[PDB]
Design a binder for this molecule. Sequence first.
Ligand SMILES: NC(=O)c1ccc[n+]([C@@H]2O[C@H](COP(=O)([O-])OP(=O)(O)OC[C@H]3O[C@@H](n4cnc5c(N)ncnc54)[C@H](OP(=O)(O)O)[C@@H]3O)[C@@H](O)[C@H]2O)c1
Ligand SMILES: O=C(O)COc1cc(Cl)ccc1C(=O)NCc1ccc(Br)cc1F
Ligand SMILES: [Br-]
Length: 313
Amino acid sequence: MASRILLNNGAKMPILGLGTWKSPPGQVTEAVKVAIDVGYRHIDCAHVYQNENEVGVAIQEKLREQVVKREELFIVSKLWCTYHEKGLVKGACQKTLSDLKLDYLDLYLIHWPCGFKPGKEFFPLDESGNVVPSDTNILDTWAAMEELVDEGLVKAIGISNFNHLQVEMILNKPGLKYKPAVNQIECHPYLTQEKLIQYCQSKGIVVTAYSPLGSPDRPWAKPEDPSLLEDPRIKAIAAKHNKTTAQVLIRFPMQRNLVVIPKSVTPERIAENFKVFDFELSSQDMTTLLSYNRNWRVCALLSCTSHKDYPFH
Ligand SMILES: NC(=O)c1ccc[n+]([C@@H]2O[C@H](COP(=O)([O-])OP(=O)(O)OC[C@H]3O[C@@H](n4cnc5c(N)ncnc54)[C@H](OP(=O)(O)O)[C@@H]3O)[C@@H](O)[C@H]2O)c1
Ligand SMILES: O=C(O)COc1cc(Cl)ccc1C(=O)NCc1ccc(Br)cc1F
Ligand SMILES: [Br-]
């Protein structure tokens, strides 16, 4: 498949990007420098990841070095849940731009459908451990995102972790000005997402697959959880193709017309993960990988489950 996918804003998005959640601030600058040197042109970021300044150092250095031009990079960030207020969205976006050393983002996402009480804490809790909601809804937050396009701060806007009904809510918004370009969701062989992907793709929304390797470094991992990278069935498909299991896990979403954003801070893995354009999984391989679905989610969070807009069940 082509290396870039056309979005419904008329721009092209690289189907392979570098993830940055959990990338330590003392390692992520080098990770991003290496990624750009070996061909990555898409970086997935977020304010809540606490490392945008260090990501930005790498981007700016590579632009200064003229390794790449700004127009050839596709930089994505996300509006955190404590900034779903009319009067906070622009400043949140601007702080991300300032940190990343950019004058625009290629894509800005509503990180989660849920608004939380504004303040210093990213997860404000009540005295019993429940997240404290904001009363601001996804439609008003979307209107605020639309303003960012109209102010030139972002070239595209989208959503992340929106369920079917939430995507539909946006699409049915009275007075909708810009459709979401992307819905970024968890997707891998244990959470194959056939239903939500078909819905989004049928509406011209591009899906980005996060945690494609099963996020083995997620801080809440438990020793007994399933492991994609260690699954002997996936290893066998990889061996057949003379590729690594990670390479199969990255190529899988690409052949479903998804964008995919594996994270690494290991230079050799960053390079490995990019070497996914010179082989093909068969249809039988694809169906076989799909058959491993078990509705197993990396990203979920008990403290947020009573929020009215919590997306999962
Ligand atoms: N929108 C959202 O709500 C959301 C949620 C989750 C994730 N995301 C985005 O999606 C990105 C990817 O997801 P993720 O970080 O959860 O996990 P992931 O990409 O599925 O897995 C990352 C883990 O896999 C390891 N790894 C990477 N390449 C490997 C290879 N070739 N062989 C073996 N191990 C390898 C990494 O180790 P090393 O780094 O030590 O090499 C790290 O421990 C995130 O970083 C973030 O940008 C977004
Ligand atoms: O959300 C992400 O991108 C990855 O996960 C996290 C990253 C950081 Cl830096 C901190 C915490 C998470 C994290 O806990 N994410 C899960 C999450 C969050 C919000 C909601 Br409404 C539901 C939910 F499942
Ligand atoms: Br949420």
